[PDB]
Structure 1
Amino acid sequence: RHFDVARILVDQAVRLGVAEADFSGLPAEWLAINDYGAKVQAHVIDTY
């Protein structure tokens, strides 16, 4: 179910503000979020 979960979370989380570091020119890293190898590239959302 995890993938089905992740989309649903993202479709929610991203609508809330945006990441300010996105405009610093520094790419975000692929932080792991579970076992089996799943990864997420995301800057911290700061500006709502």
Structure 2
Amino acid sequence: RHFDVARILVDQAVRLGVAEADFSGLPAEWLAINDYGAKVQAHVIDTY
């Protein structure tokens, strides 16, 4: 079920403000979010 959660969670998170770092020109890293090799790329969401 992990995928079907991740997607949904992201859909809920991106409606809440933006991330100010996205204008810095500095790409974000692919942070692992579990075992088995799942990764996510997103800056911290600061500006609500």
- TM-score, normalised with respect to structure 1: 0.97
Identity rate, percent:
100
- Alignment gaps of 5+ in structure 1: none
**1:8-48 CA distances to partner (integer Å, 9 max, x unpaired)?**
10000011001100001100000000000000001000001
Distance in 2 of aligned mates of 1:43 and 1:33: 14
- Distance in 2 separating the partners of 1:44 and 1:6: 16
User: Number of residues paired by the alignment?
Assistant: 48
Higher strand share: 1
Quote the residue 2:32 is aligned against.
Answer: 32
Q: After the TM superposition, which parts of structure 1 deviate over 6 Å for at least 4 consecutive aligned residues?
A: none
d(CA) in 1 for partners of 2:15, 2:28? 18
Partner secondary structure for residue 46 of structure 1: coil
Which ranges in structure 2 are unaligned for 5 or more consecutive residues?
none
